[PDB]
Design a protein around this ligand. Structure first.
Ligand SMILES: Cn1cncc1C1=CN(c2ncnc3[nH]c(=O)[nH]c23)CCS1
Lengths: 20, 404
């Protein structure tokens, strides 16, 4: 599933913002 | 079920517009023209709506729901602008708090669980290094956050208790929320069921109704910034990107996954970006992952403006229809940004079971109440490397934060 492709990635941790 | 939405009308409709919208709708669902399932009930519902809206006595007290919201907000603006014009400064001192644990780190500084040495009460202290904030060019962002936090009051916002500064740091002391971030519980649980997601969503919807009425854009909705209180209700934290905006604004800021197209594109944008972000939050919450993920942010950006969204097969059709209208690249078509504003979202089928007043009063039973193990327990938070708190002998950046 896409949920498997999700935990197969690394964007699983806390998302940092961009301030630009 | 809003009677005006049933007859497709403006709250301000004339009685002739009501009598003509009623004939136009009843035809479409008259069994002489419509045997399909549910036309029986929609015909009954169009009958009730005309009966209420065309009696000026029933119309007046049905109209009291919107009149109550209108008055609540009018008063919430008066109280906000008072604190907006006279903001609280220097309402405590660092030596009044016992430092216990770091609750999270950032480029700006950290967040420390602390205890007031006189009242023993527990608080979350946001510590911001002045030099860093200058280095990160986030001076206005840090004056905004303190200014807005000290002026708002709403059940699902964190509460700022004290703020002050020393020679080296800025300090923001908010009430401690022991349940931790929605992010932690979401990653561990996987996903919420649609009724679980709808519980949080409804809180976000009311909070944005409040913020937008103050002309505030929030600009950082994501599960990381949603604290869970002891009764299982949301507290929105982190207003570093929030701005008071009457018209358009232009900054590229926020978290890539949650960014509306018009934030990424160079053109300007308004508070409709918060409703796009609400779509992303409902998606993530119910799918267990965001609708737009990829390893480079420009790849996320491509998927965002691409206009295509895939839903998991367990997504109910009402939910996909709500999501299609919030994740709407064309802002002249995006829910929350139309003639009827937030009511298009509150009147949506996916929310039909939602008692908006009970949610605001916090009378609805919460679907998850985090593990309470003490007035100062930290189990619901991750573990971060402590570091000691330095304060120069000479005042850093006096001019840039004299307002704080
Ligand atoms: C306010 N509060 C009450 N109980 C716990 C808390 C905390 C809030 N967090 C943050 N709040 C505000 N700005 C932030 N910038 C960050 O990088 N993290 C931030 C971190 C988790 S704990």
């Amino acid at each position: 599933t896409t949920y498997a492709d999700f935990i197969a990635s690394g964007r699983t941790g806390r998302r940092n913002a961009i301030h630009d | 079920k809003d009677y005006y939405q049933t007859l497709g009308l403006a709250r301000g409709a004339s009685d002739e517009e009501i009598k003509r919208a009623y004939r136009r709708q009843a035809l479409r669902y008259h069994p002489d023209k419509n045997k399909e399932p549910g036309a029986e009930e929609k015909f009954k519902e169009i009958a009730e709506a005309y009966d209420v809206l065309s009696d000026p006595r029933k119309r007046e007290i049905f109209d009291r729901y919107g009149e109550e919201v209108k008055e609540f907000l009018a008063k919430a603006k008066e109280d906000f602008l008072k604190k907006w014009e006279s903001p609280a400064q220097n309402t405590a001192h660092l030596d009044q708090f016992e430092r216990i644990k770091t609750l999270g780190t950032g480029s700006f500084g950290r967040v420390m669980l602390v205890k007031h040495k006189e009242t023993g009460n527990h608080y979350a202290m946001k510590i911001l290094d002045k030099q860093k904030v200058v280095k990160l060019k986030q001076i206005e962002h840090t004056l905004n956050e303190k200014r807005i936090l000290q002026a708002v009051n709403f059940p699902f916002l964190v509460k700022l208790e004290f703020s002050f500064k020393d020679n080296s740091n800025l300090y923001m002391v908010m009430e401690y929320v022991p349940g931790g971030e929605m992010f932690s519980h979401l990653r561990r649980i996987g996903r919420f069921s649609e009724p679980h997601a709808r519980f949080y969503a409804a809180q976000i919807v009311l909070t944005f109704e409040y913020l937008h009425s103050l002309d505030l854009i929030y600009r950082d909705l994501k599960p990381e910034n949603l604290l869970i209180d002891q009764q299982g209700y949301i507290q929105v934290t982190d207003f570093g990107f929030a701005k008071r905006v009457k018209g358009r604004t232009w900054t590229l800021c926020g978290t890539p996954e949650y960014l509306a197209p018009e934030i990424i594109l160079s053109k300007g944008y308004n508070k409709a970006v918060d409703w796009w972000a609400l779509g992303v939050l409902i998606y993530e919450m119910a799918a267990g992952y965001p609708p737009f993920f990829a390893d480079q942010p420009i790849q996320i950006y491509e998927k965002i403006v691409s206009g295509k969204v895939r839903f998991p097969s367990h997504f109910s059709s009402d939910l996909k229809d709500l999501l299609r209208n919030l994740l709407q690249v064309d802002l002249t078509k995006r829910f929350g940004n139309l003639k009827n504003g937030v009511n298009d979202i509150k009147n949506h089928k996916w929310f039909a079971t939602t008692d908006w007043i009970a949610i605001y009063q916090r009378k609805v039973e919460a679907p998850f109440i985090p593990k309470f193990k003490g007035p100062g327990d930290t189990s619901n938070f991750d573990d971060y490397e402590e570091e000691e708190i330095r304060v120069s002998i000479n005042e850093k950046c006096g001019k840039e934060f004299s307002e704080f």
